[PDB]
Paper text:
In photosynthetic organisms, L-ascorbic acid is produced in the Smirnoff-Wheeler pathway by the multi-step conversion of D-mannose-6-phosphate to L-galactono-1,4-lactone, the substrate for the final biosynthetic enzyme, L-galactono-1,4-lactone dehydrogenase (GalDH) [EC 1.3.2.3]9,15. GULO, ALO, and GalDH are generally named aldonolactone oxidoreductases and form a group of sequence-related flavoenzymes belonging to the vanillyl-alcohol oxidase family. They oxidize the C2 carbon atom of their monosaccharide substrates and thereby generate the characteristic, redox-reactive C2-C3 double bond of L-ascorbic acid and its analogs. GalDH is a dehydrogenase that reacts poorly with oxygen.
Multiple sequence alignments and structural analysis outlined a noticeable discrepancy at position 113 (vGalDH numbering). GalDH displays a strictly conserved alanine, whereas fungal ALO and metazoan GULO possess a glycine at this position. The A113G vGalDH and sGalDH mutants were therefore prepared and characterized. Steady-state kinetics analysis revealed an evident increase (from 15 to 200-fold) of their kcat values for all three analyzed sugar substrates using oxygen as co-substrate. Stopped-flow experiments further confirmed that the A113G mutation largely improves the reactivity with oxygen; 300-fold for vGalDH (kox = 67.5 ± 5.3 s−1 at atmospheric oxygen concentration) and 70-fold for sGalDH (kox = 14.7 ± 2.4 s−1). The removal of the Ala113 methyl side chain creates an access route for the oxygen to diffuse to the flavin N5-C4a locus. This feature is manifested by the presence of an ordered water molecule on the re side of the flavin, at 3.8 Å from the C4a (note that the substrate site is on the flavin si side). In the wild-type structure, a water molecule in this position would be prohibited owing to the overlap with the Ala113, consistent with the blockade imposed by its side chain. In addition to the N5-interacting residue at position 113, more residues in the flavin environment likely contribute to the oxygen reactivity in GULO and its repression in GalDH. Nevertheless, even a simple, single-site mutation can drastically perturb this enzymatic property.Fig. 3 vGalDH variants.
Residue numbers in the entry: 8 to 268, 282 to 506
The structure:
Amino acid sequence: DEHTITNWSGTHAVRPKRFFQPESVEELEKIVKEAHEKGQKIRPVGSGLSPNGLAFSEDGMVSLALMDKVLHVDKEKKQVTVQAGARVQQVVDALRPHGLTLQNFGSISEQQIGGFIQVGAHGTGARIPPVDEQVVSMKLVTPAKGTIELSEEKDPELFRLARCGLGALGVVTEVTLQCVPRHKLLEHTFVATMKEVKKNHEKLLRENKHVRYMWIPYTDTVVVVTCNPLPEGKKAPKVKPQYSEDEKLQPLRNLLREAAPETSPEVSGLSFTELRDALLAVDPLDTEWVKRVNQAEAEFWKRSEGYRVGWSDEILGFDCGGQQWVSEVAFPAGTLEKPSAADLEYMEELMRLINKEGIPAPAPIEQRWTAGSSSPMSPAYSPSPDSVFSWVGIIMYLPTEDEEQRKAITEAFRQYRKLCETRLWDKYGAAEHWAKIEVPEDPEELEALRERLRKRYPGVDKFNKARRELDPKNILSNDMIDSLFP
Ligand SMILES: Cc1cc2nc3c(=O)[nH]c(=O)nc-3n(C[C@H](O)[C@H](O)[C@H](O)COP(=O)(O)OP(=O)(O)OC[C@H]3O[C@@H](n4cnc5c(N)ncnc54)[C@H](O)[C@@H]3O)c2cc1C
C-alpha cells in the first residue's frame, strides 16, 4: 500500500504494507478472521491524529473510516448508537436535529469515535468524566472470539477494560454514547494572579460547569476560562475596556518588530497563533527570548477578557492549529466533597522546576479537570464516583518545517518532559494520556516507565490477560503496546 499516514503535528508517520478499509461489518469480520488465520498485523486506526502515533503499524492497519453512520438515536435515554468510524464532528452534526450533543469535547472534533474512546479522551469539568465513562455499550470484533457485545449488562469486566483498550483487545465497530440536551454556554475569559487563583479555586471548580486554566510560564498571569449553562435568552455581558483585534495583538507585533526580522502587510495577516509561532521561530530554545514572548502573550490575554455565548460544541473547542510536542498527565485532586490542593501544588512545583532548569517553556500550560472513570486503563481511573482529576498539559511549538530547528525542539521537549516525569509524576500519582506517551529507547528508562505503569494501573495484568485471550497472535498490537506491556 502507498497510503502514508501522518499525525497532526508531523512528529510520527507510517506507510503500512497492508491498509484495510472495509465498507461493512461483514467485510471487517472477514478481514479479522483472515488476518488471525495468517498471523498478519491489523492494528486499528481512526483519524491517525494521536500525538504519539499510537495507531501506527508498518505491517498492517485497519481503518473503519467508511463505516461512519449514526445507526440509532434513543430519544428517551438521550443515547446515540454510531459506527466507530464516524468523526466526532459527524456525530455532533447528526445530533443537532435531535436536540442532543455529547456530554463533553476536547479541543478538536476530527477524531473518530473509536480513536476517541480507546485512549480515554477528555474535556474539562470537575463533575464530567472522560468519554470512555460515557460509553453505554459497544460491539468488538476480536481475533480469537469473533464479534462480542459489551455493556454494564454484558460482561461488564471486559466492557470496562475494552472501551478504553488502546486498540489492543479488538476492532470496535459500533458504540452507544450517553448524550445530554443541546444547550448554549456562557464562556468567561479573565486573567488572574497565582494568589487570586488560590483564593477562589475551591469554589470556582465546584460552582462552574467547565473550568480551564492557561498558565503562562515566567509571568504571574493565569488565564481562567469558565463555561456555564446560559439561561433561555441571556446575552453575553460586555467588558468596559473594549480592545480591537489590532490592540490585542499590539504587544506581540511590537515584540516581533524588535527581533531580527509595529506591523508589515505579512505580519498583519497572522492570527494570534501564527504570531506566537513567528515570535518563537526567531529563537525558540533561548529562555531569555521565550520570557519576553510569554510576557507579550500575557498582555494579549489581559486585553482579551470578556464573554462569549455559543452552543457547547462551538464553545468548548479551542485552537491547537500549530504543530507541537505535547505531554499531558492526569493526577488525583481529592473529590467533590473532600477538596485537595494537589492541583495547584503541582503547578507551583512545575513553575519552580521550569525556572530552576532554565526550560524555554512557551505558553500555555493547560490545566483541566474531570471526574474519575471506572475504566481500569483510564489515566483518571478511580473507585470514587465523585473523584476529581487534574490534567496538566505542557507544550513546545514546532513553528517551522525546518528539519534542524524541529530536531532541536524535539530534544528540548524530551528533556522538559523527563524533568516533569522524574521530579513530579511519582509524587502526585500522575498518569500520561495514552495518545501522548512516548516509548524511551534507553532500556533503563523503558523499565522505569513499565514500573510507573504497574504502580498507576493495578489493572495492567488483567489488560494483558485480555490481550492473550482475545488476540493470542498479537495482530492488533504494535511495537509501542508490546514495549509498554511486555
Ligand atoms: C490537536 C489535537 C488536540 C487534541 N485535544 C485533545 C483533548 O482536548 N482531549 C483529549 O483527551 N485528547 C485530545 N487529543 C488527543 C486525541 O483525542 C487522541 O489522539 C485520539 O485518539 C485521536 O483520535 P483518532 O481517531 O485520530 O485515533 P488514532 O490516533 O487513529 O487511534 C487512537 C487509538 O484508538 C485505536 N483505535 C482507533 N479506531 C479503533 C477502532 N475502530 N477499534 C479499536 N481501536 C481503535 C487505535 O489503535 C489507537 O490505539 C488531541 C489531539 C490533537 C492532535
